[model samples]
Target: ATKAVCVLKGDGPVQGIINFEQKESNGPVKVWGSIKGLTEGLHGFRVHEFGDNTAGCTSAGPHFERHVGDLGNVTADKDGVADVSIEDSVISLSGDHCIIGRTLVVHEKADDSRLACGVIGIAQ
Candidate 1:
């Protein structure tokens, strides 16, 4: 089994846990988690390029717009929480397109700045 996990945190109140799991090779990746401290409505949930986010949201490389990095958007409820359940076939935990060690970011909104982000890594 191949699995990945990311703990999103930043300079503000945004915080959460994201998990990635693959039960079979070449199968859809199941990504699920919940984020808090966001405003009502949708948020740009994406995977950035680099894992070096030591300088706020700069080192993660530009907001990835390509296939694998463009994770679309995640909707946040009135409670400032976004519960995620995504099945993506284009992303994987193994192979050339593996997303492990990459940076996952939560944008304030589409076409907006970064609010929080975390590095993805192998799960226990």
Candidate 2:
């Protein structure tokens, strides 16, 4: 099958959305969003293992780890915004392995490595 892309939009407590598109190379996934309305700091993001949104965004469940394992935690930049069009440890996974119809989640209180969620979804 040909490579596909996943899209995510962040909301609540924060404003703006991010568009993520994947490819078959090491180039960063294209991130087009503004954390400007966010609290000028690092918010957390990642691909979750499940595609279920039944439990609000929290139901997404954990990072979409494949073989290399979970690297953990996505972040915005000094401008309270991020353009992860590069290799970011947070959303960076072996695309071919873990990301076919995966979920995306942004937390409410920085990932704390646990709870505190904002939004969620599955890759279509």
Candidate 3:
């Protein structure tokens, strides 16, 4: 199974890269990434509906679920770096909730405050 990669871009010193992997045809997707330059705490993270980052982070809209909130959260240590490890079955690389062409955002908190964002794309 091939994996996909994404690069998170931010306004401040925030930046990171994420990877998605599915070992089998019918298996859970594993997400792993490292984000830097965040506050020391938990922050909202998810895949947004649109791939467009032209209008800014908030413009990306919520995940396909229409709830527009954290699908999951990641924690940053004292040095402001977060190591993300998420495994879920709902979203996938090829399915109804397939994340391709969507946006990935990391917010300041659990709900709002846009921080960094990037559009999910094919690794190659």
Candidate 4:
């Protein structure tokens, strides 16, 4: 399952779309995305437990206790734009732990903010 995310600032200027590709079933997942309006630094990137972010972006839940969606960080330089290509072996697109309906979060520093989030869905 090739999943993607359309991140929104929900309230601010940091937002972007991220694309995820898979290996086998529960194999290494390659992540690619371009972020804009960041704070010119390393932004905390991770996945949430739920897609229902109505309560707010935090509605996605904690960082899976560092599990399948525990993707590291994205580096946004001085221009406030970042393009990342990451590969996490613990990620999956199939099986019980797949991240199909989860949420991607971007927590920016520089200003210490919960800038954006987007739900992960199938690439159809």
Candidate 5:
């Protein structure tokens, strides 16, 4: 079943939503969402180690997996919107590597400057 999750944002026009779906037949869990209000081009997007945003995205620390280096990047349209649809094999729904209690951050300038963010949540 598909369930709606929470979407957290920073102090700006940029925002987005993330939904979690269980894998079928031993497949990887999937994450899909739509983000808007960003610069026109690719921006750094990744699951940070921490979920705290009190000190802004800086407190989120480096990517959960450093080798991957920011889960690739998200490209925004000229209208400042980006649609996200990716299969996450590294992050699990329930495990030590599970993304729950972590944070997803969208940077303004590719690995720098926070534009938007949200804490990962588990399905109810």
Candidate 6:
């Protein structure tokens, strides 16, 4: 069994979850896959630090940006698990709760004002 699946409209084509891996990364889940045809640019993504899918993605909360005084998402480099580029959308966790026991969510927008949302879960 799994949670719910979500989708978001991008500037170009839509992206797919392809697959999700639940283990130990930087967070509770580190998802991997190819997003179809995303804009050739940097974009924002997150696990929402929540489990609610109500009101679209707003229920998911911020981009799990738990770091303090880190200039928010912009402060994070645009590489590896810290990259902020859409093309650099590749994600890899590495923390106490990295990809362990949580759900992954992808946003259509740049996570600016909360727009499109998708909820990803691991299969049992």
RMSD of each: 1.8, 5.3, 2.4, 2.6, 2.9, 8.1
The residue-by-residue lDDT of candidate 2 on 8-69, one tens digit each, is 43334444444444454455444444433344455565566776666655677766624222
Better of 3 and 5 by TM-score: 3
What overall lDDT, based on C-alpha atoms, would model 6 receive against the true structure? Answer: 0.38
- Compared with the true structure, all predictions reach lDDT values of 0.86, 0.47, 0.80, 0.76, 0.73, 0.38
**Top candidate when judged by lDDT against the true structure:** 1
Where is model 2 poorest over a 10-residue stretch in terms of lDDT?
Answer: 113-122
TM per model? 0.92, 0.52, 0.88, 0.86, 0.82, 0.45
Q: How many angstroms is residue 89 displaced in model 5 relative to the true structure, after the best TM-score fit?
A: 1.0
Mind sharing the TM-score for model 3?
0.88
Error of 6 at 123 (Å): 1.9
Off by over 4 Å in 2: 1-16, 25-36, 65-81, 88-96, 109-124
Q: How does model 1 fare in lDDT?
A: 0.86
Instruction: Report the number of the highest-TM-score candidate.
Output: 1
Q: Per-residue alpha-carbon lDDT of model 4 for 19-109, expressed as tens digits?
A: 8888577577788979898877787887778887887687888765346666778888789998988887776777777777888888865
RMSD of 1: 1.8
Residue range 1-124, candidate 6, lDDT tens digits: 2222334433334444434443433322223344444444434455555556666556766544233111112112222222222211233333343332333444433434442346544454
How close to the true structure is residue 106 of candidate 5, measured as C-alpha lDDT? 85
Where does candidate 1 have its weakest 10-residue lDDT segment?
62-71
lDDT of 5 by residue, 1-124 (tens): 3333548588899988877776552457676878898889988888888888779778878787353325668888999888888776666665566667778888877643787787777666
TM-score: the better of candidates 1 and 3: 1
Better of 2 and 4 by lDDT: 4
Candidate number with the higher lDDT (3 or 4): 3
